[PDB]
Design a protein around this ligand. Structure first.
Ligand SMILES: CCCN1C(=O)OC[C@@H]1Cc1cc(C[C@@H]2CS(=O)(=O)C[C@H](NCc3cccc(C(C)C)c3)[C@H]2O)ccc1O
Length: 375
């Protein structure tokens, strides 16, 4: 019965993908950002310039105050509020109702986005990174304990809406085979990258550099973020491959956006990036290939024209590798919590390049993959 959940997501990689939910009795409708990069369920509970609606605890008869404060600092943006519990449901999700923890946001800073269309956030990662501490059971954990919903979900983010299949895998949302990588540790959705190639060229770095100090799958992050050393190597390789044309130094920093005559974007000059992930069997891995149409996020024409403009969706990180929404977009991603693994398959709503195609290929042989994990 996953068909009811197909296409239940809206938004983009820039402002975030969100799903509709209801909290309290009577049910209060709110759009909630889908974030596999955090573990707190929180909604605006007070007026805000960017909010068109918010959670009103007083109007809910099922609301319960936990008499405890909470705050959450994200890489960018933060909020604080009061903890409590209330009945929660997902209209275009499993037909169930569960009591989960809810952080009523009373104050925030650079958290809500103007015009994003969402007023809350659904942290889908594990309790280990929940605030104030791992005692605050995350939404998905509550859902799985209180109902018969299987312990797993899948995300199909489509750039250029999308689907969040709660409790299973919808075989009609992807093509080819699903390839699985182990979830290294249950806190963020941590994985291990064992090799990286640009246009078939191996970056030739100590694979530990790829996972320094970790690598995570974050639907709540827009770009592909890479550790300093890896970012520099990647940019250097991407520059050479596209040396045909020159771009502002600010462009490679994700500041300036490059434009081209409507339909003249030189995709061919931009290389494909292949990230190899640790597999399920000894010395085995697989790779996902990212096309330029993925790491070149399209943006509105800053001018008064109508030319195709984009922003370099690859940026430097100091908190490890982050496989964000722009990476997830070409693929169907299965967060198989039950079997502690993450699956990747070519999405039905994949990118359409002329002579190239985003892919998930295997199997590959890779020795000493364990040494790729950072400690
Ligand atoms: C798809 C579009 C996503 N977006 C984005 O990147 O910036 C704006 C936009 C929407 C948006 C998303 C988030 C979720 C954050 C984003 S982050 O870029 O901050 C990485 C972090 N996950 C990793 C992380 C990093 C530090 C601390 C924590 C704890 C909460 C466990 C977790 C994640 O939860 C918070 C506020 C927002 O306005």
């Amino acid at each position: 019965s996953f068909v009811e959940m197909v296409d239940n997501l809206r938004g983009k990689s820039g402002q975030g993908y969100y799903v509709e939910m209801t909290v309290g009795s009577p049910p209060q409708t709110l759009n909630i950002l889908v974030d596999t990069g955090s573990s707190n369920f929180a909604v605006g509970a007070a007026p805000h310039p960017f909010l068109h609606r918010y959670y009103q605890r007083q109007l809910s008869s099922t609301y319960r105050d936990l008499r405890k404060g909470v705050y959450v600092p994200y890489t960018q943006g933060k909020w604080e509020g009061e903890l409590g519990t209330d009945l929660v449901s997902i209209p275009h999700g499993p037909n169930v109702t569960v009591r989960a923890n809810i952080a009523a946001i009373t104050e925030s800073d650079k958290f809500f986005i103007n015009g994003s269309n969402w007023e809350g956030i659904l942290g889908l990662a594990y309790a280990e990174i929940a605030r104030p501490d791992d005692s605050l059971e995350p939404f998905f954990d509550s859902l799985v304990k209180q109902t018969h919903v299987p312990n797993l979900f899948s995300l199909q983010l489509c750039g250029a809406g999308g689907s969040m299949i709660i409790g299973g895998i919808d075989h009609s949302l992807y093509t080819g085979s699903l390839w699985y990588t182990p979830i290294r540790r249950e806190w963020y959705y941590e994985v291990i990258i064992v090799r990286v190639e640009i246009n078939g060229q191996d970056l030739k770095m100590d694979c530990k550099e790829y996972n320094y100090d970790k690598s995570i799958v974050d639907s709540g992050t827009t770009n592909l973020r890479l550790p300093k050393k890896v970012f520099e190597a990647a940019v250097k390789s991407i520059k050479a491959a596209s040396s045909t044309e020159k771009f502002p130094d600010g462009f490679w920093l994700g500041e300036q956006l490059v434009c081209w005559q409507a339909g003249t974007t030189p995709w061919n000059i931009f290389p494909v990036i292949s990230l190899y992930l640790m597999g399920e069997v000894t010395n085995q891995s697989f790779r996902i290939t990212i096309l330029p149409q993925q790491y070149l996020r399209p943006v509105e024409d800053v001018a008064t024209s109508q030319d195709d403009c984009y922003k370099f969706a690859i940026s430097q990180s100091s908190t490890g590798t982050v496989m964000g929404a722009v990476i997830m977009e070409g693929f169907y991603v299965v967060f198989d919590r039950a079997r502690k693994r993450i699956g990747f398959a070519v999405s039905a709503c994949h990118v359409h390049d002329e002579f190239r195609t985003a892919a998930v290929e295997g199997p590959f042989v890779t020795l000493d993959m364990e040494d790729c994990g950072y400690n």
